Design a protein around this ligand. Structure first.
Ligand SMILES: [Cl-]
Ligand SMILES: [Cl-]
Ligand SMILES: [Cl-]
Ligand SMILES: [Cl-]
Ligand SMILES: [Cl-]
Ligand SMILES: [Cl-]
Ligand SMILES: [Cl-]
Ligand SMILES: [Cl-]
Ligand SMILES: [Cl-]
Ligand SMILES: [Cl-]
Ligand SMILES: [Cl-]
Ligand SMILES: [Cl-]
Ligand SMILES: [Cl-]
Ligand SMILES: [Cl-]
Ligand SMILES: [Cl-]
Ligand SMILES: [Cl-]
Ligand SMILES: [Cl-]
Ligand SMILES: [Cl-]
Ligand code: NA
Ligand code: NA
Ligand code: NA
Ligand code: NA
Ligand code: NA
Ligand code: NA
Lengths: 309, 309, 309, 309, 309, 309
């Protein structure tokens, strides 16, 4: 990665997570306050890890396409950093919604995520407004909120997740960076829970209990893991973090996918929402509605430091 | 307690917490669905503790005053179970707000709280509407969100917390039960953080770093721990659980206090909001606004089972 | 329990377990060697717990009916300590098989169970021959090897498991003791795994994923949890510990049930193997074959010490 | 114990330990400062346990015989609280050395012991002078510094350690209290390490590897565990905590023994230093030299509170 | 390693272990079923590590010499992959016994090893028969079952264990692979335990308590660690995992050694069984009998994937 | 580092620590005994890590300037290995005090540090005399004993600590080595504790509660973190480990700093004790007195092995 250290874009999914999306304000301190956070970001992480070395603390910081150009007009721009274009299928739509800054905060204890987030609040006071804050949690043995283990397909063991999450020499000025895409999905849990397990397995493409992938013969072409694994060893590093307000019957998945090239993520989204071939849409979308969709660029630590100067 | 096993009303504060307050609906299944939960409540707890014996899982279930009489007209009524009467001081008000059912869910992992809460959602579908759901977290070494350790005054070590949290033979028909009072407080963190530590210590009545109580000579009469410790060995078992949406600058404390007699809690509230003497109000209320206030009765497990029959 | 301390008969199920059943030999040292173990049993447990206070070490020791009378002719005999009589149904049989001594060894690490067992081997050299040794393990979140959580029905939370596991003043000379019954079951995993989950749930009587008991309307009368919960608040404390040699396709459950009265266990077995009414047998027996069955008496520590004198 | 809650006198041995012995000064604040600590002692423990609920924090506080009478002339005196009288054998002497206050501080982390001790330092400033401070540590699986597991003989499993550590109705005014005796031993490690293991086992009376007690036939009458187990079910609760400055070749054991009656401890000491019969001294004293010896009274929490009034 | 990722051949020894050796059957599905496992092996590991990231799950898969040629006739063959030739000394024999597939499964919980093994059973049904299954456990602080710490000599700290366990460019077509040799040893524990510790130390070549290597002057030339450390910085990565059925008096060590070149392992075996010089055999073989001996090739993950195509 | 593996000079700070400084004696075994430790050092570490893989055991070994030349006259000498020259300011002095060997021992349990240290004592018997032994502990969330988090400035996250701690090709014969400097500081805790928090923050240069660095506008030029961060990306890897004997009112910090070049450490010391500009001394020195100061060279493991030949 040209000797550039990436942010934690190939990290495992935390036990506790905070996703914050901010929009910038037009205040006369906005650029400076954002740059203060850029300058001090790795120090804030150092502080947490020094204080709580066993709590697996991590935070990543990303920038929206318009925000990047506003904040950093002379820094160039990653080749694929452009506002996400809505993908509208015959039935489902991957919406494109606002967001200038993304913070993805993970730790073994929620109190540490809060601590970091509170300092961001203080440092960015007047410079930002909240677009979304979602709190997530690890559910059992890495299950998505629909009760199936998620993440087994992430590159690991015989592949290096950094290879798939981090920009390389194909865009050398931004090597060590990453393209991260987020979507909030709201589930129809009543309809999902009405499906027998065997039908749920056909929707997902893996066995519910033991997480073993369905055989080609058993796996339908519109299974979630069939359509989202686009092939040709093109992969991203994904979470699907549960969030919920059960008292209101609200159950969701916060999708976050880090990629060396956004083209992979976008192809996955095309396969899901349009279908390959057209109409062969992700069956899981019959139970899941995308209500946000935003692309951010996550710079290498080296670049982040330069941004803060 | 007349041989009655209490719910977990003298438990320590969890690492992760969900507070849910429901109102009952007028559906023709409402009483039956609530009774199903009553009947199966200890089984649901058994399941969690059997599956995750090291995760310190706990849930308590309580009933509002009006709800109790609606649901269980022939079961009698605890002597102090009456709708909380708002306490209006010259400056501050402890508001009285709605709530028919309370669930207080605690565990070492938020995913387990979610699991339990999702089953409550399913079992109570159509019988309830959400009044409030708040998610809390343990912050560092048991700090309240204002950065001071909280809970050291809870009866422990040389006193038995059950003695102070659980109804005894003074109301024998409900021995083993508890009166629980909840309040959501929203903090003015900007004003709080502007105070030097030494002034913050005078507001709280303990040292910030080492949690040592201020000496009588140093402790003001309007310190939080001066006014809320009402004396005569009358005590309750309290949490003040942090909650926050930092992206919106929202910082709060979810107060929950379990008592053998609500008269103690009410006297504490009088001391805080009216002052003893009048005007000697809790200085912490200059930085904290109560936005909910509700009393619930938490029956013994024995009684809970009878309620579900 | 007449002031008698029971052995660990209401303990939770260990992470690692060793079940050993010995027969006595006719050697001229047999009684003395057994008495040496009786005399030193609580010391051996003290040693383990002193050395490894966080490893949840436990061992229980029990005696077969014939063995008890051979070893201890003048100590009287528990009222229900008689060789188990085989229960033969129209289709299934709960066999009665040999065993003079039972050791049930549990800990957070298998190495500690081994340590204790090796010392028993040394102390009993020449006095015993192995009838069976089975090693078990906790499987996920307390699942039985058939993939369903087991043990949720064990008395806990609003009931005291000692009340159900320990002999009381109804047999005062043996108060603090327990009746323990063991059975090895071999499963037909191929047939079991061929069942859809919804049919598996009807066999067990609980939901597979969330361990919620089936409703009366949904639960068949021959479900495992219907037939084994005999009613009238008559209960025992059970494990169903997984064991396996997967390379040979061997999958089993080692049943062990501690009871204040063996009559409860025997009634449960009648319900399973004969049926109540006759023919209403445990559906789980269509997938599980009992290959051992033995009753042992587990004395209080006080009595155990006397036995060793 | 007359309804009196004892201090942690039957606690297990901590991972990290601080033993502090203070003498009182003649300052005109000495009694008041000591009483401040008495009054606030259980609060200081509450604070630690509230902040660090999983760190097994404990502290006990005891008073020397002369100090008790100086500080509390009108509180009466425990029947056996008298300055320890040196026990001089033909070869070895159990010395009697000064000490007015004892603090025995234990936790899973040394930093917590330090925290508590620093607050004691602050509260007692000018009122005390240090007689001894020793820091100890748990060594492997509860080994004493001579490489043998220690503490297995402590009452546990089939006996209640409080019964042996806590004063009962035989001295009702002080029920809930305890007699604690401390000795620092310095070892001749070079001589000890020169002994073959089999001879070391004869000195101790247990096997080195597996902690199994030697048989009567194998155990010499002067073995440490033979002479210190005085019989007739008279027992105390002991630690022998390792301490060392290896750079100076200094290896020691800090003995601390809590007893319901000091007469048991004193009889043990007679057996060790004089011998029963005379000359049958503890063989371990051939490798261990007592350099301190002091008796303290550890009051119940109830009494401690009264002392602080 | 030519850019090839090795299997976990330099892993530490698990807390719980399963060793399975299978023979292939002559069924018309055998090759395909084995290839299915090859193709899905890294996915099965990904699943376990995704679900249980803190449980240190690992599995390695190896092939016997004859099996390799049967299954993969056109893949070439590692230079040293040939059926192990029995080493017969004047007194002891390192036997050569059957085995086509080896699975070495390790984790912090035995239930996870079982899970993985059960899926192998299902996937290989009809294609294999069990030759041996042995379950092992970590014993105390990494002790072998003879009570001495084992594994300290494994390359680590100032050497890289992969260098010694993994084939390099000397056999480039198989770089990233490993030669693994397994032997089951049965111990004469009665004879071993009859040896004084000082003689046991001379058999092993290290001190029993502190694991310090004997000095050259003290260490006999036939000590286990003298004869098995062949010199010239030629090393392998070894376990000696305890296994036992104590009820039958059966105590064993399951030897498993991973090597970049089998020539090192074979030289070690020559030193042990024949002696260097002849007759200078491993003294530990006077207490240990080899009852199996088989060589397997453990391919890199890259190659394993190709094998499964 | 020329392919040389460094000792643990960029390790995190242990939970428990032992610092030992020895002087050599003039005995006729001194060189040989030191060389025995050199030869066996990595083996001793291997043993600890093999036995206790989860206890984060570490030890580093360093040599004083005079000692190096005495022991190893023909090995050359690191370019900056010269006896530390006392730095005397107008008010404060960084003293230079004796020491020939340094051992820095860290682990999650103090018993493991003791174990290692005891073996060093045995191996070095007669060859050394103790200059200092200090025991340290981690205090809360990595706080120095003055109650502020320390170590956040250590290179990490976006920098590699080895780059700053380890000698590179600028001194190729010693690449992989490190310069370590130790100082014992004694604090005036009474004066420190009398400072309001806001003044303490000005002395340190960070906020006490949240460890956030003071802004340039708020941070005085004589703040500890201003003067010790010398700039130009010149950094060392530091601990400031707490030690104390609270009973004597003794509170200290054991400074230890590992550096690729001692010139950085020395410049830091100049800034602290003399001031840059002169007189702009570290304000923390108004509360901290240096009582030792010694430089040691910590060789790579490769070189250490050669030294032991
Ligand atoms: Cl931590
Ligand atoms: Cl710019
Ligand atoms: Cl797009
Ligand atoms: Cl758990
Ligand atoms: Cl009613
Ligand atoms: Cl009211
Ligand atoms: Cl332990
Ligand atoms: Cl008898
Ligand atoms: Cl029967
Ligand atoms: Cl804790
Ligand atoms: Cl008095
Ligand atoms: Cl005396
Ligand atoms: Cl895990
Ligand atoms: Cl082929
Ligand atoms: Cl060969
Ligand atoms: Cl460990
Ligand atoms: Cl030299
Ligand atoms: Cl210098
Ligand atoms: Na501005
Ligand atoms: Na209805
Ligand atoms: Na005999
Ligand atoms: Na005074
Ligand atoms: Na076929
Ligand atoms: Na010499």
């Amino acid at each position: 990665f040209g000797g550039h250290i990436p942010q934690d874009v190939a990290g495992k999914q935390g036990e506790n997570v905070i996703f914050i999306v901010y929009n910038l304000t037009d205040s006369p301190d906005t650029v400076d306050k954002v740059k203060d956070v850029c300058a001090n970001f790795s120090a804030m992480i150092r502080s947490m890890r020094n204080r709580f070395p066993d709590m697996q603390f991590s935070c990543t910081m990303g920038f929206g396409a318009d925000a990047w150009t506003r904040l950093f007009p002379d820094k160039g721009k990653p080749k694929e950093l452009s506002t996400f274009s809505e993908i509208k299928g015959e039935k489902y739509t991957a919406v494109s919604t606002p967001g200038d800054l993304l913070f993805h905060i993970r730790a073994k204890q929620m109190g540490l995520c809060f601590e970091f987030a509170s300092i961001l609040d203080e440092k960015l006071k007047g410079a930002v407004v909240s677009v979304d804050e979602t709190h997530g949690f690890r559910y059992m043995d890495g299950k998505a909120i629909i009760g199936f283990v998620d993440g087994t397909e992430n590159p690991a063991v015989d592949e290096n997740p950094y290879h798939f999450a981090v920009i390389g020499e194909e865009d050398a000025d931004f090597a060590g960076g990453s393209y991260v895409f987020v979507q909030k999905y709201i589930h129809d849990m009543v309809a999902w829970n009405a499906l027998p397990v065997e039908q749920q397995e056909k929707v997902i493409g893996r066995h519910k209990f033991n997480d073993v992938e369905l055989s080609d013969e058993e796996k339908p072409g519109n299974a979630h893991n069939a359509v989202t694994n686009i092939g040709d060893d093109l992969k991203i590093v994904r979470a699907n973090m549960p969030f919920a307000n059960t008292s209101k019957g609200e159950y969701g998945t916060y999708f976050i996918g880090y990629a060396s090239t956004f083209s992979t993520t976008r192809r996955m989204l095309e396969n899901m929402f349009i279908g390959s071939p057209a109409g062969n849409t992700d069956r899981l979308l019959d139970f899941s509605t995308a209500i946000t969709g935003t692309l951010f660029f996550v710079p290498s630590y080296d670049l982040l430091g330069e941004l803060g100067e």
